[PDB]
PDB file of C-alpha atoms (C1' of nucleotides) in Angstrom:
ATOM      1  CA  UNK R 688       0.000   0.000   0.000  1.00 21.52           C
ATOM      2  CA  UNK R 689       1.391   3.680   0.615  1.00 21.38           C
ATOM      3  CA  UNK R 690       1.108   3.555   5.003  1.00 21.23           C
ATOM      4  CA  UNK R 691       4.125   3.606   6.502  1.00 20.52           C
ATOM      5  CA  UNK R 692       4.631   2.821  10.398  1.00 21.75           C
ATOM      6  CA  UNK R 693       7.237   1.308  12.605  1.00 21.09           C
ATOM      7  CA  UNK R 694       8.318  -2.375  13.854  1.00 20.68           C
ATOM      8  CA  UNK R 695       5.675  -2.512  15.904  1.00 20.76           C
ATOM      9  CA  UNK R 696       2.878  -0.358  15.169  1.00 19.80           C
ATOM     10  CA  UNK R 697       3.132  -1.569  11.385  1.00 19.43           C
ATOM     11  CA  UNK R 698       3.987  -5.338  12.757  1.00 21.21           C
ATOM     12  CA  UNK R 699       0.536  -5.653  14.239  1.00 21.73           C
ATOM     13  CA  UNK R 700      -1.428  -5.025  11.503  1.00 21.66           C
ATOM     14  CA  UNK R 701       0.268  -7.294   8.978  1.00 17.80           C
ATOM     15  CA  UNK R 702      -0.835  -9.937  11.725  1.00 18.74           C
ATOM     16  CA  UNK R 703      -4.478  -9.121  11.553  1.00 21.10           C
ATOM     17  CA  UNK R 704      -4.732  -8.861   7.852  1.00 19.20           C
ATOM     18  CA  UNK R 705      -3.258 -11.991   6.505  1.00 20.43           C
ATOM     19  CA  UNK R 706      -6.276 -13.783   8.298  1.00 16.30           C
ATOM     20  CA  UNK R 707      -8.782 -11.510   6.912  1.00 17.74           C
ATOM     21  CA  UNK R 708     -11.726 -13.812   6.768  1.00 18.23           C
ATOM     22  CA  UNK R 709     -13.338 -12.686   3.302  1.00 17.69           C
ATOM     23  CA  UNK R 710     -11.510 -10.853   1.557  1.00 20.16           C
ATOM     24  CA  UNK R 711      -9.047 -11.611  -1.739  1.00 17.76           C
ATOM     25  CA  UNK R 712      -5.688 -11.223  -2.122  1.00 16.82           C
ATOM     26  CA  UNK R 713      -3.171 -11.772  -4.648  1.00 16.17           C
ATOM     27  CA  UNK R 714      -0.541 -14.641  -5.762  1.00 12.90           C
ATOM     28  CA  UNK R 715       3.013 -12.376  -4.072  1.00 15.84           C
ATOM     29  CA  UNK R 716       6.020 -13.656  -3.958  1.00 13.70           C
ATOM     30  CA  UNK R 717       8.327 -12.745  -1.217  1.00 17.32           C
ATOM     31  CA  UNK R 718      12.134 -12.371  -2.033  1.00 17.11           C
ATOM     32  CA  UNK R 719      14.055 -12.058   1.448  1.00 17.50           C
ATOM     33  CA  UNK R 720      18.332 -12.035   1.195  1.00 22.91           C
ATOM     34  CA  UNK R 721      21.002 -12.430   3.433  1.00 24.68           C
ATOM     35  CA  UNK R 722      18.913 -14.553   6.461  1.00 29.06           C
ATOM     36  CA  UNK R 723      21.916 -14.508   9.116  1.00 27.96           C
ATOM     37  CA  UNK R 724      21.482 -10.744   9.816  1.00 30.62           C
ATOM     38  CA  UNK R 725      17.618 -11.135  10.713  1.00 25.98           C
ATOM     39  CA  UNK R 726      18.578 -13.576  13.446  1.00 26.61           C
ATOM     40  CA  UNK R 727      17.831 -12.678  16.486  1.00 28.22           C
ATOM     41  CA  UNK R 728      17.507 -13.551  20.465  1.00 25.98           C
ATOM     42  CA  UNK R 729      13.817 -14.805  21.085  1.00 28.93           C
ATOM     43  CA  UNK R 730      13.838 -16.295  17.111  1.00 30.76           C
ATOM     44  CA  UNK R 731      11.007 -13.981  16.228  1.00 31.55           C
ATOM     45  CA  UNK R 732      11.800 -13.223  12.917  1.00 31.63           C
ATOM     46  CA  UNK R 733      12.097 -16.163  10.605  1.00 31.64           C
ATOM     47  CA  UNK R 734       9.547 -18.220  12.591  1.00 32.60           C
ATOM     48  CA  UNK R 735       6.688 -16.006  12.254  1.00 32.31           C
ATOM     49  CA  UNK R 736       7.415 -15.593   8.340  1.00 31.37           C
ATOM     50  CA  UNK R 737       7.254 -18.731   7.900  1.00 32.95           C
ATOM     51  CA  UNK R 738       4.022 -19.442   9.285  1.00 34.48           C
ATOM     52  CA  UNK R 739       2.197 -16.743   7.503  1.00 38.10           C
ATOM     53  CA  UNK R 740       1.998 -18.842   4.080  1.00 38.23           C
ATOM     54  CA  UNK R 741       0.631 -21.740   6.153  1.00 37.55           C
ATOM     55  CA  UNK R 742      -2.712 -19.991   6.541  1.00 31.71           C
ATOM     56  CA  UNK R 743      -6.107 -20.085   4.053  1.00 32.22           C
ATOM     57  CA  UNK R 744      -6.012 -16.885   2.408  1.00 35.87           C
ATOM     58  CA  UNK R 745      -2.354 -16.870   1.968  1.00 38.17           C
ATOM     59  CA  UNK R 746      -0.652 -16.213  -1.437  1.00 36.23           C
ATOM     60  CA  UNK R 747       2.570 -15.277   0.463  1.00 29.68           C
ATOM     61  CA  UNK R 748       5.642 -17.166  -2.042  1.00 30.83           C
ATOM     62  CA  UNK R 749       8.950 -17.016  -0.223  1.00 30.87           C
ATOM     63  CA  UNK R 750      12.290 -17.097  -1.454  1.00 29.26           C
ATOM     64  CA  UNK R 751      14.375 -17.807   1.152  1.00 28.65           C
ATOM     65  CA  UNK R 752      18.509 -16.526  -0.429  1.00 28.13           C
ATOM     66  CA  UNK R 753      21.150 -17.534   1.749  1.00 30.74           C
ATOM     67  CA  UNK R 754      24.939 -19.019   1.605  1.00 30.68           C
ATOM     68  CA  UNK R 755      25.594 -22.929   2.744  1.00 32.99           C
ATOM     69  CA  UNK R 756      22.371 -25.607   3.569  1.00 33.27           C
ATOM     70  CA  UNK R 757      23.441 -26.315   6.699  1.00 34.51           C
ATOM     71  CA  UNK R 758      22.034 -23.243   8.423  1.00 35.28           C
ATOM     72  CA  UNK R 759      18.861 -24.372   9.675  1.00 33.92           C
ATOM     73  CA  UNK R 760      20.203 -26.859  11.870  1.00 31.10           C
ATOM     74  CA  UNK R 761      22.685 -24.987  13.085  1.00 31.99           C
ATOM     75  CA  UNK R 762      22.204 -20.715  14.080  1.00 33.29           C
ATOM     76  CA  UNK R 763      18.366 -21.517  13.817  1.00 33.34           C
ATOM     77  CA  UNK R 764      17.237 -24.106  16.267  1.00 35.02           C
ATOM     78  CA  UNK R 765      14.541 -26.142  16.271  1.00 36.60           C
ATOM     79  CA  UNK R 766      11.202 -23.956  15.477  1.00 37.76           C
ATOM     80  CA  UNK R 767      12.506 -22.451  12.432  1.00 37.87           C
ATOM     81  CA  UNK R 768      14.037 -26.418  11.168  1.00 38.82           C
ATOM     82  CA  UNK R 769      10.345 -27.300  11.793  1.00 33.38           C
ATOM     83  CA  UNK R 770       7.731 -25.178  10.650  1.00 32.54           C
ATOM     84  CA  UNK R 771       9.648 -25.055   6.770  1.00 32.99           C
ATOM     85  CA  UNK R 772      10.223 -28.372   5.467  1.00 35.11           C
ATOM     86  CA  UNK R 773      12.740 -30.406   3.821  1.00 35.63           C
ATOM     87  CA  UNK R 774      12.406 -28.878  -0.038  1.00 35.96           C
ATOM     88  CA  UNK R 775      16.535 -27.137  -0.353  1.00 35.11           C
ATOM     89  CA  UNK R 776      17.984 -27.994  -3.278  1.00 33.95           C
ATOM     90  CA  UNK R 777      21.506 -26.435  -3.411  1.00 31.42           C
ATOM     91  CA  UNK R 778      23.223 -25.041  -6.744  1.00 31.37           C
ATOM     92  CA  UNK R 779      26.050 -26.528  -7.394  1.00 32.23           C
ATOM     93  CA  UNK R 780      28.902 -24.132  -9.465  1.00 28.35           C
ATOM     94  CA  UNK R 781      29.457 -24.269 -12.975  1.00 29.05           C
ATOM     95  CA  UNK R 782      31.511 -26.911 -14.703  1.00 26.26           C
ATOM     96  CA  UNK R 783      34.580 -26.352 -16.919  1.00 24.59           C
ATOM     97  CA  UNK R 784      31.904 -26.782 -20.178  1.00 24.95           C
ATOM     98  CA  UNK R 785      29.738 -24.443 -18.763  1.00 26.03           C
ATOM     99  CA  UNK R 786      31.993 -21.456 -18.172  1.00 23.90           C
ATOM    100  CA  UNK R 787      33.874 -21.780 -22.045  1.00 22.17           C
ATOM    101  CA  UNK R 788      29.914 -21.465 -23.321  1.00 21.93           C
ATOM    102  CA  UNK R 789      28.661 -18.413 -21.480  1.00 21.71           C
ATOM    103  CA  UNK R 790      31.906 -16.422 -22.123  1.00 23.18           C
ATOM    104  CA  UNK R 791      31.467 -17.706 -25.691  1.00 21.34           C
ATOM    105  CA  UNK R 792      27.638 -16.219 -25.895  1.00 23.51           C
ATOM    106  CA  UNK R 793      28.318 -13.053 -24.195  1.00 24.73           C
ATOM    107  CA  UNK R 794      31.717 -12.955 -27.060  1.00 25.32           C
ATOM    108  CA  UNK R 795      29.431 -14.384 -30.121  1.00 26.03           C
ATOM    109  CA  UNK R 796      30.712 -11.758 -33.052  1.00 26.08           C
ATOM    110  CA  UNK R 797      34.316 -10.279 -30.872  1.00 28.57           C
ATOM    111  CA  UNK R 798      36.919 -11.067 -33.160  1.00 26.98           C
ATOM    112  CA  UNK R 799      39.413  -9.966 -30.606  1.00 25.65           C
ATOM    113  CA  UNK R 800      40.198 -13.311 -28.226  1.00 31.97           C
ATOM    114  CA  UNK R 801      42.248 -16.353 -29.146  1.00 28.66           C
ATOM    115  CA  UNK R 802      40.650 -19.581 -28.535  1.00 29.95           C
ATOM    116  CA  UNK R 803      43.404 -20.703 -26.418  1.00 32.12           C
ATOM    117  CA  UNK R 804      43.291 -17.412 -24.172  1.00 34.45           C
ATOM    118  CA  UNK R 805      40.018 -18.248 -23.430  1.00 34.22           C
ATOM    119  CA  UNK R 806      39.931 -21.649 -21.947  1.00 33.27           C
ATOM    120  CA  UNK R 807      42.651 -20.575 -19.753  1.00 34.76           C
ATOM    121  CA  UNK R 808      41.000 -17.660 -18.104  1.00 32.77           C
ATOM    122  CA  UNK R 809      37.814 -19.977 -17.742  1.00 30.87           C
ATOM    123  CA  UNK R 810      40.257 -23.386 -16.049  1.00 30.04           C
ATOM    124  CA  UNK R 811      41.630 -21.176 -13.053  1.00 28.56           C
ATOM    125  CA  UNK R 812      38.537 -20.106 -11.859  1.00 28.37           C
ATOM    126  CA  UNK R 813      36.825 -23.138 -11.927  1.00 26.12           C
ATOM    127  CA  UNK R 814      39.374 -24.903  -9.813  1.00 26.62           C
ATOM    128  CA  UNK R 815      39.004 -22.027  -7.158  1.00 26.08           C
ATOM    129  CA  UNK R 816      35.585 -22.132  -6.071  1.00 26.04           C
ATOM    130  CA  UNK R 817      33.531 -22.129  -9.523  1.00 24.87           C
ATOM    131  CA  UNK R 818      32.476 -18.528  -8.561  1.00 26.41           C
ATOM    132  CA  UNK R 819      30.749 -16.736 -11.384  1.00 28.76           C
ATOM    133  CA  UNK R 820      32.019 -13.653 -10.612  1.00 28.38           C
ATOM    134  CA  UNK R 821      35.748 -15.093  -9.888  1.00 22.54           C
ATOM    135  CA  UNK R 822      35.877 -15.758 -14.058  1.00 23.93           C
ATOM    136  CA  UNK R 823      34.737 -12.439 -16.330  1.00 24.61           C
ATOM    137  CA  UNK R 824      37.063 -10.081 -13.748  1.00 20.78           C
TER     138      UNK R 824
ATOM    139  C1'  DA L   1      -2.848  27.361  17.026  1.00 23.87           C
ATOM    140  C1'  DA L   2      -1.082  26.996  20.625  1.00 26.21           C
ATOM    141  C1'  DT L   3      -0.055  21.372  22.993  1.00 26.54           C
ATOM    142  C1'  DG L   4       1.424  17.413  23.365  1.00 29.20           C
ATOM    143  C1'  DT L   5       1.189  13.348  21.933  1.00 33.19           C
ATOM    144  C1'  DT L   6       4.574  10.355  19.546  1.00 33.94           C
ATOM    145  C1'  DT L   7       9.379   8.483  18.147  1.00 35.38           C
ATOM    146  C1'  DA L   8      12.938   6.740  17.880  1.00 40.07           C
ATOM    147  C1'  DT L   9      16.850   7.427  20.833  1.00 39.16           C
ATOM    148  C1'  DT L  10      20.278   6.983  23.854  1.00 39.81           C
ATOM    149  C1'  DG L  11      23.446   6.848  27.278  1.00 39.71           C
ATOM    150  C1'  DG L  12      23.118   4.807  31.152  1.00 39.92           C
ATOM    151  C1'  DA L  13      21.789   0.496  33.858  1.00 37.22           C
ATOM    152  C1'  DG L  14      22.492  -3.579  35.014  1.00 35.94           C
ATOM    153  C1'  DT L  15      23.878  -8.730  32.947  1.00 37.34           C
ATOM    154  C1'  DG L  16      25.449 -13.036  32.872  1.00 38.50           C
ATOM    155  C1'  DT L  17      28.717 -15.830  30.832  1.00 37.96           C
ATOM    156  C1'  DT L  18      32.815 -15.575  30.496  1.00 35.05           C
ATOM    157  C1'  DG L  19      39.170 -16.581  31.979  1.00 37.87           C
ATOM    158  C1'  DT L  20      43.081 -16.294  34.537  1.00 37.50           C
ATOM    159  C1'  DA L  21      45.047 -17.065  38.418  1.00 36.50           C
ATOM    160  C1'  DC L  22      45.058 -19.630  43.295  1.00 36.22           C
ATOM    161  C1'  DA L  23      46.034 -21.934  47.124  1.00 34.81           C
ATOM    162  C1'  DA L  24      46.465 -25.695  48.816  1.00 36.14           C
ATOM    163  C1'  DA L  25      47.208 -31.344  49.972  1.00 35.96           C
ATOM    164  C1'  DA L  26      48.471 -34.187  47.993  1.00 32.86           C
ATOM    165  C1'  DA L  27      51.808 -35.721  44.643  1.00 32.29           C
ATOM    166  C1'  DA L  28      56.451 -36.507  43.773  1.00 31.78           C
ATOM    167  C1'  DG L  29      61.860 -36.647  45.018  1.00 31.52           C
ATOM    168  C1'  DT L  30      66.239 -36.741  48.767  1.00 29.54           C
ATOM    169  C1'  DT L  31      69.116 -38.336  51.236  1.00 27.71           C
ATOM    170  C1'  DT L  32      68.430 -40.108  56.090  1.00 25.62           C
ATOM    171  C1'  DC L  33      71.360 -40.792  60.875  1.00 28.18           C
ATOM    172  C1'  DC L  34      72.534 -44.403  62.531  1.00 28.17           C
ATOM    173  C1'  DA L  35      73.753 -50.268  61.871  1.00 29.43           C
ATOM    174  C1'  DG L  36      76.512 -53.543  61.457  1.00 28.85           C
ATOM    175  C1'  DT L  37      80.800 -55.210  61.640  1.00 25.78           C
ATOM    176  C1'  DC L  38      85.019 -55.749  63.092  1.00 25.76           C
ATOM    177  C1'  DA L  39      88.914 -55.142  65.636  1.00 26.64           C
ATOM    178  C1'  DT L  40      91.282 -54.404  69.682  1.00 29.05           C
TER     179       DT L  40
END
DNA sequence: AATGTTTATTGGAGTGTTGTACAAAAAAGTTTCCAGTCAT
């Protein structure tokens, strides 16, 4: 909407209107980064989130972005492991094919790179980390 | 228009879990002060 309030003043009424009884909503997704820094003392932040889509009238889609799997069972405790469910599939990095074809799309018509400075640029970087940003620096 | 709430804010105001000694009661080790012998 346009209202702006505060943590708290603003945090109640988000409460009350997700269970509206009769009235529609929309199909939102939710795109939330960086999960460590929200963690807090009493766990009150990425418990309650995650229980809002677990209503009736809920359209709430959320898109949890954070670094390794492992961090549910480990800063979180056991609330936040529960209430979620077991659906993480990780990304694994790119492979040495993969990173000599998207350097080769993004240099389709640049006559101006040997083919055998190319595949060099493209091996050290995937024996680092795989890091897409580690290979077009 | 003449007030008075809010609105974060903020430096206190404690806070509890830390970590580095701490002072023994033992653990060691350290020969021990005669013992034995032997003679005369």
């Amino acid at each position: 909407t346009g209202q702006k309030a505060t943590a708290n003043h603003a945090a109640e009424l988000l409460a009350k209107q997700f269970c509206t009884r009769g009235s529609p909503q929309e199909t939102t997704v939710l795109l939330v980064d960086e999960l460590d820094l929200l963690w807090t003392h009493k766990q009150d932040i990425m418990y309650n989130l995650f229980d809002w889509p677990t209503h009736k009238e809920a359209r709430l889609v959320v898109l949890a972005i954070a670094n390794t799997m492992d961090l549910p069972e480990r800063i979180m405790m056991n609330r936040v492991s529960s209430r979620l469910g077991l659906t993480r599939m990780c990304f694994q990095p790119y492979t040495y094919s993969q990173l000599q074809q998207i350097l080769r799309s993004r240099l389709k018509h640049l006559k101006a790179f040997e083919d055998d400075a190319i595949q060099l640029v493209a091996r050290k970087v995937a024996a680092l980390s795989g890091d897409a940003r580690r290979c077009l620096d």
